Amino acid sequence: LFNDMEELVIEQQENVDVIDKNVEDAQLDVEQGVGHTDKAVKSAR
Amino acid sequence: IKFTKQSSVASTRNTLKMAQDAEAGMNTLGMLGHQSEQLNVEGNLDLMKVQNKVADEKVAELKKLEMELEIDRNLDQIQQVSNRLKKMALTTGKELDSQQKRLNNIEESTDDLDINLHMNTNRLAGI
Amino acid sequence: SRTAELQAEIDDTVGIMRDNINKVAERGERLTSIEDKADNLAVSAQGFKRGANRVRKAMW
Amino acid sequence: MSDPVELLKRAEKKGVPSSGFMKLFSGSDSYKFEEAADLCVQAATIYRLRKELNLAGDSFLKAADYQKKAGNEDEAGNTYVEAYKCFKSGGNSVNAVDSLENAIQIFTHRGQFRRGANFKFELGEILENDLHDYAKAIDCYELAGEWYAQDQSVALSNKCFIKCADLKALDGQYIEASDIYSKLIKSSMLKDYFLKKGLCQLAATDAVAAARTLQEGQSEDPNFADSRESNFLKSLIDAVNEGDSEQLSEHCKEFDNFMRLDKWKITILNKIKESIQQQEDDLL
Amino acid sequence: MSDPVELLKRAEKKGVPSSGFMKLFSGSDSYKFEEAADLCVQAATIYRLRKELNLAGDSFLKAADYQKKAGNEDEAGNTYVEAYKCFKSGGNSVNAVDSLENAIQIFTHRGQFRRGANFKFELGEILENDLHDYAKAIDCYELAGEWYAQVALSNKCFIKCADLKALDGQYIEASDIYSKLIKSSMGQWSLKDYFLKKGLCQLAATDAVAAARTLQEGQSEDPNFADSRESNFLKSLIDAVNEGDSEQLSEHCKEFDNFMRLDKWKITILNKIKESIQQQEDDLL
Amino acid sequence: MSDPVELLKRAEKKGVPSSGFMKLFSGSDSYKFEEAADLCVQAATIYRLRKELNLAGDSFLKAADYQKKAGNEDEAGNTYVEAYKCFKSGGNSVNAVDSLENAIQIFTRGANFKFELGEILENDLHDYAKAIDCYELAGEWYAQDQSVALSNKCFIKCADLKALDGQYIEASDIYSKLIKSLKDYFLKKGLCQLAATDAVAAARTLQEGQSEDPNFADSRESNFLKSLIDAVNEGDSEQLSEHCKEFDNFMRLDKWKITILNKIKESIQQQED
């Protein structure tokens, strides 16, 4: 049972890596996008 | 009887050994702490929720604009390890439960953010 | 009586941890689905960035 | 704080579409509906702060309707989920069901099957537990498990088909529950699934299908040959073939002594016993 | 609710690029492709609600192609994932594979090797079970694991890739992948299996010294495998092939089965080793 | 597919800042740098589809540099991480290090990548000192972020590398921080103290662990540590070896413990000589 649990947890390590990375990239892209909409609002005024 | 005692000693040796081996429960739990910290992702997701609120308001405005003894000792050590292994099964179950609820929350939050971003992108497309 | 107690304790740890196997099942599928979502989220974030940039340029 | 009744009143005034000659001079009615929806959301927020949860749900429903009129269907789905949360925390199961149905329709129309399935499952849970509409709960679990099986989410779909099969078996649809258990087995290749399949077959008085299920389980994965569940299924099949209900009850007691029979198993075994006893009475 | 066939016809009518004089006065064709893509998506959501999964998948493929023509490659990949979804659920494995191929190409083209690898693994799974395309599935698993390396999905993919390679007659390369798995997983249980499997692959390649050194490596490097009944089994297999006595080999297989049931992979490899002893028996006369 | 070489060439041609009189009529040079970066990213993608990974990394470095001139530092950091990936997959560890250093500078994420940088320094380049620095600094960055478990991983790596590097006292101090796995931390602390000819501090570490943590009190590790302290106080190197073999028999000594135990034995034998 330990073997099955540890191996499966070995598998889940990539999911955790990918999730951290993907959400991190998304956060930065959203930050840039919000900044762009801020500058756009500044211009339309 | 000497043969039976020899077989018993051999099997207690193997038993202690496998018990030590399972005691993998550590690499699992240590890494689960590692990935627990990685899922605490949640920080990024909260920040996106705030920043999508900001995007909503901005873009809305944009649109508006001897042999016996060895058996005994091996059983002693097997007991010690097995007690500790029981603790590890209990705690691993607990941590999986907590992380499962956390992952469900992460799940719903990420999809909500995905939808809100598609919404804002579409409404930016028409401006 | 010690050996029987040890056997019982081992059996109980086996039970707890069979349940753990099922729990990490649910966690593993959870992690696959969440990977697909954050993949989607990264796409949508990049697209939102690009659309906001394009509106910023159009208006400028 | 603003009065939520006042906010809803202003929302209703703003939510009137431009009719007649005024339609030629008024811009798109979308903006009016957006503003009415924002006002309704504000009223819902104020109600939720006042723990007047059902009123908050109603205000969210009005907001979602205005959002649908505005063309912002995704906003409407999210607001229906908010109305849902308010109703469920308020114990108003019926309005909660309606909110999830609207939201799931919006989500499925937009290709968001994952969210639609999550909420269709929660809808099934509300139908099963608070409203006891077991049929529509079965339908919810089936449809949403299919939606997950599309997304490759095997473990979800398996939970879903477990719930669907359990409710079907409790509802007397033994054959269909056994078929769903076959799907679960195939997707998981589990001991519990083999046992439950066989039990459904016994409740359908088809001991031959139960024996084939036992042999399949024994052959395809070794953990079944040696499990208590396989032995118990064999023993039940033997009792059913022998038409002797007391032996079946003894086997149930033994198995209860080593692994507690949950409520579902007790029900199925009771109906199997009833079929045996009915056959015994019919032969006298 | 609109007729999906009418929506598809409208999309096809709108999907014609501007040609000749009208192109000088008509704006970018991106808008027309966007409209066709939206409309095919609507028609497909309709088909999909009717459980007509194959038609929904075909409409998804059409919309994805139109989106590719529109320049929105990410949305084309998402629509390909939808096409895949309805094809696999509809039992059409080949069209599901085609969607996976288009999707993965888009994804690697966008720097998203991750998703490409996940969907390459799904593609290899579909190939192995439904279409029995073993070589191309082997390639898919290898590429998925490589991109994953670029730890665990790669470890999983390498396990399956080595499994298919060894069962397919390619013992040496499967053993090399098992060595890669050993090196990546060192520092445990997966290792306990790896050493045995590597030895089995090399013993199927008639290199008894290779199985011997593999077992010795497992014994010296991994204390677990050193003590594991897998190591004693691999020693016993090595001995039985060394003496060239198929009977003791058969008894060792039975003994191994009695306590841990043997898997189809190991049965095929050990049957190949026994049949190699029978080829040796022919090599005697 | 476009030729990546031509895309790069177009990127440099666009990437020339406006000089002299033309600067008065040209808008912000940011847009030119953005377009050159886009061309470089395209070239990097094309190389990377070809498995010409090092060229893809170089193109990403050029793109990140153009992004830095544009003022889009966040994109520069992401692109440096892309260049890093290409180099690490390409076996070019030096350019991978350079990429993470630049990226961690922009980010200061910095802790995640500073740890990965430490791993490259440790395993591929064997620059143990600056890897130790990486682990220390990035564990501190986690400690600020209240990520205890990660920071503990970091200080484990830092302390192990320090102890292997002869900095026994500093490793013992990091083990004190890690204590404040616990049984293992106690053992390692004592061991470093023994490598510093510090038997009394080992005795106190043992006493601290025994009194404060019951699981360590009765553990094999505490028993091993007392036996080692007793041998060291006795100047009895063969007894130390015997205890080591016993503990190896019941609990395999990893390479780190073996190295430190050999150092302790050598210090005893040197006092004997």
Residue numbers in the entry:
A (entry chain K): 213 to 257
B (entry chain L): 433 to 455, 457 to 473, 475 to 499, 589 to 650
C (entry chain J): 27 to 86
D (entry chain I): 1 to 189, 198 to 292
E (entry chain G): 1 to 150, 154 to 190, 195 to 292
F (entry chain H): 1 to 108, 115 to 186, 197 to 289
Reproduce passages from the article.
After fusion, these bundles are disassembled by the AAA+ (ATPase associated with diverse cellular activities) protein Sec18/NSF and its adaptor Sec17/α-SNAP to make them available for subsequent rounds of membrane fusion. The disassembly requires multiple ATP hydrolysis events in the presence of Mg2+; as few as six ATP hydrolysis events are sufficient. The side-loading and side-release mechanism explains how Sec18/NSF can disassemble SNAREs with constrained topologies.
We prepared the y20S complex in a nonhydrolyzing condition and, after single-particle cryo-EM data collection and processing, we obtained 381,591 high-quality particles that yielded eight three-dimensional (3D) classes into which models were built. A characteristic phenylalanine side-chain density in Sso1 is present at the same position relative to Sec18 in all classes, allowing for reliable indexing of Sso1. Protomers D, B and C were all ATP bound and formed the middle of the staircase. The bottom protomer, A, formed the base of the staircase. Given that this charge distribution is replicated between each pair of D2 subdomains around the D2 surface, it is unsurprising that the Habc domain adopts multiple corresponding rotational states over the eight classes, presumably because of the flexible linker that follows it.
